[PDB]
Amino acid sequence: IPAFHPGELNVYSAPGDVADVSRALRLTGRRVMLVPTMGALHEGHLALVRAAKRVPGSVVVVSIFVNPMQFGAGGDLDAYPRTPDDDLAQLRAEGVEIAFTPTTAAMYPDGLRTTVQPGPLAAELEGGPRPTHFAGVLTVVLKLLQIVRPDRVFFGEKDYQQLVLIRQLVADFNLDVAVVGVPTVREADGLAMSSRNRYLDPAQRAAAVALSAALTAAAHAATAGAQAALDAARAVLDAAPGVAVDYLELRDIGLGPMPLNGSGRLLVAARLGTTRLLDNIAIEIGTF
Amino acid sequence: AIPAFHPGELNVYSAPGDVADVSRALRLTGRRVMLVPTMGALHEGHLALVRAAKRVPGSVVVVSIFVNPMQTPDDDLAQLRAEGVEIAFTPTTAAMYPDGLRTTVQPGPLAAELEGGPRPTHFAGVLTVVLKLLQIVRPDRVFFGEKDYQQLVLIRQLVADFNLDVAVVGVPTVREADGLAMSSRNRYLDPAQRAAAVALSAALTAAAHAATAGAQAALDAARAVLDAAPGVAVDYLELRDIGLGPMPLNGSGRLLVAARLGTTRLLDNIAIEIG
Ligand SMILES: COc1ccc2c(c1)cc(C(=O)NS(=O)(=O)c1cc3ccccc3o1)n2CC(=O)O
Ligand SMILES: COc1ccc2c(c1)cc(C(=O)NS(=O)(=O)c1cc3ccccc3o1)n2CC(=O)O
Ligand SMILES: COc1ccc2c(c1)cc(C(=O)NS(=O)(=O)c1cc3ccccc3o1)n2CC(=O)O
């Protein structure tokens, strides 16, 4: 067991180190909370941390790992924002006691070998054009879960499809962890928090409010039915300068092979220049 | 409340939740949880797995019996009770797959070789169910026979690749008196086939001893023995390193054979040391 100093930010790179500390803590009665991140931390991540902090007797582990296995692509991996110094500063500010910052070598010493094969959900929406993306996500999340063995793991609702898939991973592999989804933190105008927001110029930043505007308009239009909700969202996206919509789709909450009932999720993906933005919202139809 | 558990008796659970709760309760009291996964119809090979598991001080032994779709009940339990096994886990297909087939394990490239030739997807099924069983039971050690060697290596790859906190224990293959590897298929062999089937183990043992003369001597010895058997259609005879990569010029390896006799496929494998 490596050194662990309570009340301070302890940073471990070796999977075996955090595993050992985690297990030692769990045996002393502490409940281990995991917030898995790819770094470049914003207020949305801090909301995950805070949710974890508030579980009584918790110790919070924040993982930071830019997982090469979930990138296509050529350049996407290299282009991903990396701001390590700010990240750890934020964790210290928030009173986090463990950051887990493994190397690529430690996570993938044998390269890609055994992997998670997601269900059919991974071939839709975000996964349509990116066929191995969610296999990459689920493989890393499985590994982080096995390494840290948390009682609860925290994810934002912003990447809703990812969240659903992770719930599938946990159910389908009988993992002994509770998955906690945390509502999307937004800028004051309603823009969903995102690492990618930094890539919007002032004009694109202005236009980008249209995603959240469209979703919230649809959620209130929805007393008038599905068609009205979708048409309200489409109108708002269409009014916005330089927003190219990739999909706007209304699905059941599990996004699964079932028709929408009264309760749904409306999901949007759109491009502003080269920046691709996602957002989603709970929809009640007829309210209902 | 924890499901009822009576120490020193055979406790049978069909609900994954029940065995999970009891195993956790047991671990917290100090017991080391040992898992022996099976598809039932228990034979001496399985009892060797059980006996290995029981040897660990402070062990509680969990034997799962589950016929995986993706890859005698009363006698089975009698045998386990006779061995002093305290937990049998006997789930339904529905309990194991309540949402059907969805998230699964994708084996690495090794699954496409050797047995993955006649059965490209077999190992995906095995690895998925083994992972589920490990997660439900959370054993300290899990026990497999060495007879399905490729399977065993893929399991160890699963454990490595997904950072599982279980120790994988390979137990030497139990064999009939003439050396035939124990298998549920052996009973279907007519007497001519049962006689010929001894060629698999005989070829592999001859090879292991021929190996002082080198790799080619060992392989040629094996082949000559197989060539002396009628009605034995050899699918492969392959010498590999112990992880089933290419055999190094010298050192430890494994020699693997598969053959068809009439309609039954037989496999065997053996440790080989080169030179
Ligand atoms: C509570 O409000 C919000 C709002 C938006 C949020 C978040 C919280 C969190 C993210 C986010 O992405 N985090 S992540 O990239 O570090 C990540 C890494 C990772 C690794 C494994 C599994 C899941 C994983 O998620 N985001 C949106 C964003 O950044 O675009
Ligand atoms: C529908 O169009 C396509 C196009 C290419 C595709 C697929 C579908 C499916 C795969 C695929 O499953 N490859 S894999 O099993 O070796 C794998 C690679 C990988 C990478 C990161 C994470 C997990 C991973 O699992 N591939 C890539 C391929 O065949 O090479
Ligand atoms: C120590 O000496 C031996 C010798 C031969 C042996 C074994 C032990 C065990 C088996 C065997 O296969 N058992 S199994 O069918 O119940 C099985 C359960 C299971 C669970 C998960 C994955 C694969 C699985 O396969 N066999 C060979 C046999 O019976 O054919």
Same domain, A196 and A129: no
For the Cβ of A36 lying below 6 angstroms from any atom of ligand 1, the answer is yes
Contact A115, A139 (CB under 8 A): yes
- Of A150, A183, A216, which marks where a domain is finished? A183
- Cβ–Cβ gap B103/A115 under 8 Å: no
The identity of residue A206, as a single letter, is A
Same domain, B6 and B132: yes
**Residues closing a segment before a gap in chain B (C–N exceeding 2.5 Å):** 71
Question: Which residue range is the domain that position A101 belongs to?
Answer: 1-183
Which one of the ligands is nearest to A139 CA?
A: 2
Distance of alpha carbon A107 from alpha carbon A67, whole angstroms: 9
Same domain, A59 and A69: yes
Nearest CA to ligand 2 atom 4: A131
Distance of alpha carbon B163 from alpha carbon A146, whole angstroms: 6
Distance of alpha carbon A79 from alpha carbon B106, whole angstroms: 29
Which CATH number goes with the domain that contains B223?
Answer: 3.30.1300.10
> How close is the Cα of A6 to the center of ligand 1, in Å?
26
Which CATH number goes with the domain that contains A178?
Answer: 3.40.50.620
Does the active-site annotation cover A220?
Answer: no
Residue B209: other Cβ atoms inside 10 A? 12
- Cβ–Cβ gap A110/B20 under 8 Å: no
- Scanning A149-201, the segments in alpha helix (DSSP H) are 160-172
Same domain, A196 and A224: yes
Helix axes B122-137, B16-28, angle to 10 degrees: 50
Same domain, A156 and A259: no
Same domain, A173 and A217: no
Q: Determine the distance in angstroms separating the CA of A186 from the nearest CA of chain B, rounded to an integer.
A: 32
Q: Determine the distance in angstroms separating the CA of A236 from the nearest CA of chain B, rounded to an integer.
A: 36
Same domain, B14 and B140: yes
Which one of the ligands is nearest to A73 CA?
A: 2
| Contacts A15 to B, Cβ<8 Å | 163
Same domain, A222 and A276: yes
Resolution in A: 1.7
| Residue A235 three-state SS | helix
Closest residue to B161, CB basis, from A113, A117, A118: A113
- Cβ–Cβ gap A135/B109 under 8 Å: no
Nearest CA to ligand 2 atom 18: A132
Q: Determine the distance in angstroms separating the CA of B107 from the nearest CA of chain A, rounded to an integer.
A: 5
- Of A149, A183, A217, which marks where a domain is finished? A183
Same domain, B146 and B10: yes
Residue A45 annotated as lining a ligand binding site: yes
Same domain, B136 and B225: no
For the Cβ of B67 lying below 6 angstroms from any atom of ligand 3, the answer is no
Distance of alpha carbon A174 from alpha carbon B135, whole angstroms: 6
Pair type for strands A152-156 and A178-182:
parallel
Look-up: residue for tokens 């599982």?
Answer: B164
Q: How many domains does chain B have?
A: 2
Both structure tokens of B219: 């392989």
Closest residue to A113, CB basis, from B101, B108, B136: B108
Residue A46: other Cβ atoms inside 10 A? 20
- Pick from B198, B190, B214, B192: nearest CA to B266: B198
- Pick from A141, A138, A105: nearest CA to A119: A138
- Pick from A117, A174, A137: nearest CA to B125: A117
- Scanning chain A, the segments in alpha helix (DSSP H) are 15-27, 43-53, 76-79, 84-94, 104-107, 133-148, 160-172, 202-221, 226-239
Same domain, B24 and B92: yes
- Cβ–Cβ gap A110/B160 under 8 Å: yes
- Of B154, B172, B190, which marks where a domain is finished? B172
**Residues closing a segment before a gap in chain A (C–N exceeding 2.5 Å):** none
Same domain, B50 and B132: yes
Burial class (CB in 10 A: 0-12, 13-18, 19+), B94: exposed
